[PDB]
Write a protein that binds this ligand. Structure first.
Ligand SMILES: Nc1nc2c(ncn2[C@@H]2O[C@@H]3COP(=O)(O)O[C@H]4[C@@H](O)[C@H](n5cnc6c(=O)[nH]c(N)nc65)O[C@@H]4COP(=O)(O)O[C@H]3[C@H]2O)c(=O)[nH]1
Ligand SMILES: Nc1nc2c(ncn2[C@@H]2O[C@@H]3COP(=O)(O)O[C@H]4[C@@H](O)[C@H](n5cnc6c(=O)[nH]c(N)nc65)O[C@@H]4COP(=O)(O)O[C@H]3[C@H]2O)c(=O)[nH]1
Ligand SMILES: Nc1nc2c(ncn2[C@@H]2O[C@@H]3COP(=O)(O)O[C@H]4[C@@H](O)[C@H](n5cnc6c(=O)[nH]c(N)nc65)O[C@@H]4COP(=O)(O)O[C@H]3[C@H]2O)c(=O)[nH]1
Ligand SMILES: Nc1nc2c(ncn2[C@@H]2O[C@@H]3COP(=O)(O)O[C@H]4[C@@H](O)[C@H](n5cnc6c(=O)[nH]c(N)nc65)O[C@@H]4COP(=O)(O)O[C@H]3[C@H]2O)c(=O)[nH]1
Lengths: 47, 475, 511, 50
């Protein structure tokens, strides 16, 4: 009931805090995945 | 922890060569091919395990960039950006899409005059953001810029020395290149305002490593019928014997005499040899007796190693005081080893008389892009609007240039002249020499451009004139 | 808008003394008393309106630090912290508790070897945080570190350029202190790797006279700061040209330049001496990279005044004879040149060198010989250019005292005397090439109608020999001026209209 | 059962922005708390030595 609601709240508070601390990491990974290069297109790794 | 990278200059000191992994460095070049060569060598000098990327405005970097077989990284990643300033603005995010930039060296080789249109404020903001990003990601950025006229931009870079970790320049001087390091910051300290000489052999940039002070050696003609002033004066009949005796001298004072125009070319060579074999202690003066000089020839003599050229307007007493002026002074300017590259600057146009619109514009643009010519002093571009009652063809009839580097064109009810090496103050005299009737009864208005940027802008607005608005002399 | 603070060193270049707001500067000092002296001088060197605060350890700053009544800010706010690392950590927020540090100057005077207990990584983090804080708050921090030995710390700071605008050390070496500037950055550029000799004279740190060529940044090597009269109504040739109305404003602007060409304009002789003073000041404060040019526009100069301007520090004086195009070419002829001559500290000696005789007219034999000898015994005058000594033999029709009546010198340094049927005359700062011009100015126009022959001496040894021969003349043969009662009648048909010898026609009968 | 899960999800949701805004405005919160009183310890102002 209320007790488990408080427990879930407690869980989520530092969970979201740690999620915010890793904002830069999240943005970097999302940019790697989504991969929208608008003007700079890699021509290719040359040997 | 973070590694150090190395610039693509051979035999460079460790204070001026290293590049720690956090920061931004800027390098200026005179020509595009030199920028490409320096970029290739910089790629070639790196360690095998290092991470390197190259970003180039020109398409297909796989065709213009190469790798060294003996050493260098196993692979480099190429990026291409369209000819848009938005490419530079988005550079950081666009790279984040494709690379994790921890200890990555980014060589950015821009196109010719690529940074010419970027506004000052946005360039400052770009530099600040690049410095912040580089320090955050522990990545280093090397910017290589082939440009032609970056004085204002170079001043901006100097004022923004907090964003940069180093600023250097490479200027073409015929047979050798001049490396001017404004500042360089490394783990070994900070270096300030060095001037060094670098040469390209087989495509590789390698760095090229009290007794008679009161004596005065002079031509006889310098003293116009006057006794030798002191014991320290030796009098010679011509400049040939003066050159032979000055060969032995070390810190003596040599005063040549310019009586005739034909002497300018050999005098230049003599001064060159005297300033090469004998160092900066010697003082070389050219006393001009008769009016036998142009501004261009005086610039040539100054570049060949003369301290100053004394005009014929100055009487003997003023010349003696000027001779007193140069005492105690050393010649710090650089004299290029090649002599032909100095004499080639005497006349760079070699086209006389009427030219069509396109050839005129191409010739003036080519002269404007020449690196081995004085800044803001290459010539004067004039557009003359004829008075009503006479046409531009009739104005072309009454227009006879005399020098070699003077060209004309007619188009759009304008007569556009270019006069080479003429200064803006001495323009009306030139126009009086060219036209038979006074300028003022033939033309209504005069537009004049004499600075490099102004002439370039006028040329780019002169190509917009569609044909059938051009003109030719009536047969 | 933000202030530019200054380090407490006198005669130090603006390149190594200005500290713009928004940075952290590091000072390593050898002795605590020297550290306190430098801190006090830096406190006194600031502007009156400048807001300065001091942070000290293990003492009351109100008793150890002092303010000058003649120079410095009106009031300073002191701070003291316990000898702890926690204080070094909390400094920023503790200071933010009291005053909002906008455009403030914090002097961090530490205890002896206080930064010996701080580990490397925490020191680097502290420097980064202090750099960020200074940039955000537009305040400057000056860390004065007394240290017996911080060689490893000095190396760590050497690597740490990205957090400091300047790193300097001050080491005592028995008789003088050496100021070793590793790198210094201000609004005027970056200076690096300089060793200087400084001394504490009357408790004030000063640079010994070893300025030489130490202005490393030459950002304005192409800027041309010139009087508006230099360009004869012509357009500014390039964007690098900045014109000025007079030499006073141009001088004020040029005191902040490094390697800019400064072209003055001279139109009257009344403007020579102050121009000389200004040039002396510029060459004494802004080093040898500057290009100082004096451009004559009207006839307003002698050879001696040109020598004065050259000896004050000017590279070249452009004669008014040269037209504008030649002047511009001569301006570009001096680019990239360093002034390697020696400019003395005292301008008074140079000013006195422009006229060392100060005696005009007839003289006795003794006075003439002694004056010329003293002129040639002055070791501050150009060799073989001091003047011309000329002995004149009169024509048979006239005597020697009459010839004395016929000479009226105009300049101050011209003297003459009569002896042994020889009118001898010394014209100071006259060249042998222009002796006839001077004689024509001080005699009736044809000098062959008053003198048969002349003997000229224009070299120091020659004039000394002639004076030695003249001193041997018996006193009985010396001459005296004729009294005005008998000199009223003209010897020749000439008259003096103040400064012009006009020849009066006389009646005569032709053959 | 279902209502329990629904309430759990709701609590989860409402409390995610809570810890998101708590971190986002943390610096401003600290700045305000300093401004009010905090504890100005260690470095102590001596006086205005005029
Ligand atoms: N008043 C005046 N007239 C000018 C000027 N520039 C050119 N001219 C006139 O143009 C003629 C041809 O000059 P050019 O084709 O440059 O061909 C010139 C040029 O190659 C050479 N030359 C003469 N004086 C000089 C000089 O001082 N410097 C250089 N570099 N060449 C000179 O001699 C050639 C023939 O000279 P000229 O027989 O005298 O004939 C000259 C002269 O009448 C100028 O600045 N002022
Ligand atoms: N592009 C162009 N510019 C022209 C022309 N005519 C005159 N100028 C410009 O006018 C300046 C002064 O010419 P000036 O008063 O006749 O004074 C001239 C003239 O008396 C003499 N000079 C130079 N070249 C020649 C030449 O080829 N022949 C003769 N006879 N005199 C020359 O040297 C003086 C200095 O000449 P600069 O220093 O070169 O400076 C020249 C040059 O910049 C022309 O036809 N084309
Ligand atoms: N043509 C000619 N005349 C000469 C020369 N030297 C002296 N004079 C004449 O001597 C007068 C008195 O000169 P001063 O006693 O030295 O006293 C001079 C001097 O102190 C000063 N002065 C004028 N022009 C100059 C100058 O170019 N340089 C300096 N240093 N002083 C000058 O003004 C005073 C009065 O000058 P003025 O009224 O012009 O009157 C001058 C002038 O008529 C010379 O080389 N050429
Ligand atoms: N001791 C002495 N020397 C004399 C006298 N008159 C002429 N000289 C010498 O002759 C040189 C040329 O004088 P200038 O041709 O009349 O040409 C003079 C003249 O035009 C002008 N100038 C100099 N002083 C005065 C002055 O006091 N008044 C005026 N009006 N002009 C002066 O400056 C030019 C250059 O003068 P400097 O460089 O000094 O060089 C002078 C100086 O060495 C004189 O009375 N006494």
């Amino acid at each position: 009931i209320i007790e488990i609601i408080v427990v879930c709240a407690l869980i989520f508070f530092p969970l979201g805090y740690l999620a915010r601390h890793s904002l830069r990491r999240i943005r970097d990974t999302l940019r790697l995945f989504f991969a929208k290069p608008r003007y700079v297109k890699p021509a290719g790794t040359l040997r | 922890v973070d590694p150090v990278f190395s610039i693509g200059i051979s035999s460079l000191w460790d204070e001026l060569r290293h590049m720690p992994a956090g920061g931004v460095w800027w390098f200026n070049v005179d020509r595009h091919e030199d920028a490409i060569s320096l970029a290739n060598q910089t790629i070639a000098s790196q360690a095998e395990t290092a991470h390197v990327a190259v970003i180039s405005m020109d398409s297909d970097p796989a065709k213009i960039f190469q790798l060294d077989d003996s050493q260098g990284p196993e692979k480099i990643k190429l990026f291409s950006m369209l000819n848009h300033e938005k490419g530079l603005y988005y550079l950081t995010r666009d790279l984040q899409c494709s690379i994790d930039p921890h200890n990555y060296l980014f060589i950015l080789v821009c196109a010719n005059n690529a940074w010419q249109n970027i506004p000052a404020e946005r360039l400052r903001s770009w530099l600040d953001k690049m410095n912040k990003w580089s320090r955050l990601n522990h990545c280093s950025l090397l910017v290589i810029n082939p440009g032609n006229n970056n004085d204002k931009q170079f001043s901006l870079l100097l004022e923004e020395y907090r964003s940069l970790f180093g600023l250097a320049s490479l200027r073409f001087q015929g047979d050798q290149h001049l490396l001017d390091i404004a500042f360089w910051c490394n783990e070994k300290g900070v270096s300030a305002r060095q001037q060094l000489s670098v040469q390209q052999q087989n495509g590789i940039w390698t760095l090229v490593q009290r007794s008679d002070e009161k004596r005065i050696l002079s031509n006889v003609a310098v003293l116009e019928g006057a006794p030798p002033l002191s014991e320290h004066w030796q009098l010679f009949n011509n400049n040939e014997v003066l050159f032979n005796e000055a060969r032995t001298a070390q810190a003596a004072t040599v005063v040549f005499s310019l009586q005739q125009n034909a002497q300018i070319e050999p005098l230049a060579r003599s001064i060159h040899t005297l300033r090469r074999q004998r160092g900066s202690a010697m003082k070389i003066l050219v006393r001009e007796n008769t009016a036998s000089l142009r501004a261009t020839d005086e610039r040539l003599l100054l570049a060949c190693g003369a301290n100053m050229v004394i005009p014929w307007n100055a009487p003997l007493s003023r010349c003696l005081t000027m001779i007193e002026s140069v005492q105690g002074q050393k010649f710090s300017r650089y004299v290029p080893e090649d002599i032909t590259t100095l004499l080639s600057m005497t006349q760079p146009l070699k086209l006389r008389g009427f030219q069509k619109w396109d050839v005129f514009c191409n010739a003036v643009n080519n002269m404007m892009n020449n690196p081995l010519l004085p800044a803001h002093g290459k010539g004067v571009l004039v557009a003359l609007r004829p008075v009503p009652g006479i046409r531009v063809e009739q104005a072309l009839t009454l227009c006879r240039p005399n020098r070699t580097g003077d060209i004309m064109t007619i188009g759009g009810n304008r007569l556009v002249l270019f006069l080479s090496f003429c200064r803006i103050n001495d323009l009306d005299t030139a126009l009086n020499h060219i036209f038979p009737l006074p300028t003022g009864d033939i033309f209504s208005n005069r537009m004049v451009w004499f600075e490099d940027d102004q002439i370039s802008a006028e040329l780019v607005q002169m190509r917009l004139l569609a044909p059938e608005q051009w003109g030719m002399p009536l047969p």
